[PDB]
Amino acid sequence: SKVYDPEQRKRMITGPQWWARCKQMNVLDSFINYYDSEKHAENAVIFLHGNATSSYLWRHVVPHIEPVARCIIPDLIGMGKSGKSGNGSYRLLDHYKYLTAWFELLNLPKKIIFVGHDWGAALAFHYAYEHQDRIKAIVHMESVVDVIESWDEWPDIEEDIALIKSEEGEKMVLENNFFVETVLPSKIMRKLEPEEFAAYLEPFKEKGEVRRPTLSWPREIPLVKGGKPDVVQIVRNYNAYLRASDDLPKLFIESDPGFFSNAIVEGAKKFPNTEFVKVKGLHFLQEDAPDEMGKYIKSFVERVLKN
């Protein structure tokens, strides 16, 4: 960059710059690429991206939080610079298998903090449900909070999911990279620098099966009518648990104007002990308000740990 460039270019962290700061660890039959701030390891804040993205999504958020707790940020299996799944499956429970095996190797404390976006939040919530004594706090945003029914902003959701579950949906993703090349830039308000978009494109630059995780994620959607039954049960279970979790501090980060935020905020409001903040964004809000997000999370984590 040069001094005369826009601020977003002067602040840019490229893919190679981010990847050089990551570590790799063998996990089961594969490996996970991840960022680990290491210091302040008495707590661990695990940041989980969702569809289309990777640990790179959090690169401008994490600097704010590192000074108060160890921050650990994986590329989910099949995504970013992580290895692939050994049986070629990329369902929620495949991701959960690798995530939990990875946790066992990280020297974590008994109670951890999650920061989840999109399907990353679903992984956090399911982990919490299954390990209710291992959760200190949860931050969530644009998240899978509950089972899903057609609603006012999206009246034909069943039909759109039918499309994504069809062969034409498969073409849209595996052939045309729909989620990375179309949806991702559309749901960030700002312009990504070429190198920033390149970091998201890189894992999925080739046509075909390498793009499978970006097709598999939306096919997991917990629709009340048509949802995968294992995911529907997982979400029903963790939703009931979260509604009753009076002693579990939560932070919900709403995007303004948002994508899923307006439809899911009422769902998020059903969880007790939730602090609510709002930042600029559509779906990938980390790209539109990373500093505000990082500061709100830092403050929340500090107060959770003090109280």
Q: Which residues are annotated as a binding site for substrate?
A: 160, 283
Q: How far is CA 153 from CA 108, 156, 197, 259, 278, in A?
A: 41, 9, 28, 10, 20
- The full length of the chain comes to 307
Of residues 254, 248, 246, the one with CA closest to residue 304 = 248
* Rounded Cα gap, residues 68 and 50, in angstroms: 24
Which of 283, 287, 288, 292 is flagged as catalytic? Answer: 283
The reply to whether 119 belongs to the active site is: yes
The CA R_g of the chain, rounded to the nearest whole Å, is 18
The reply to whether 177 belongs to the active site is: no
Q: Which residues pair with 26 in a beta bridge?
A: 31
Which of 33, 51, 177, 239 is flagged as catalytic? Answer: 51
Give residue for tokens 């057609």: 150
Rounded to 10°, the helix 157-165/212-219 angle is: 140
Paired tokens of 57: 């999504």
Q: Are 48 and 123 in contact (CB under 8 A)?
A: yes
| Residues of each annotated binding site | 160, 283
Of residues 69, 75, 91, 124, the one with CA closest to residue 245 = 124
Within 10 A of 276 (CB to CB), how many other CB atoms are there?
A: 12
The reply to whether 36 belongs to the active site is: no
Which of 18, 19, 102, 119 is flagged as catalytic? Answer: 119
In 119-223, the DSSP E strands lie at: 135-143
User: Which amino acid would we find at residue 192?
Assistant: L
Collapsing DSSP to helix, strand or coil, 105 comes out as coil
Which of 75, 94, 118, 146 is flagged as catalytic? Answer: 118
Which of 142, 146, 220, 288 is flagged as catalytic? Answer: 142
Annotated active-site positions, please?
51, 118-119, 142, 283
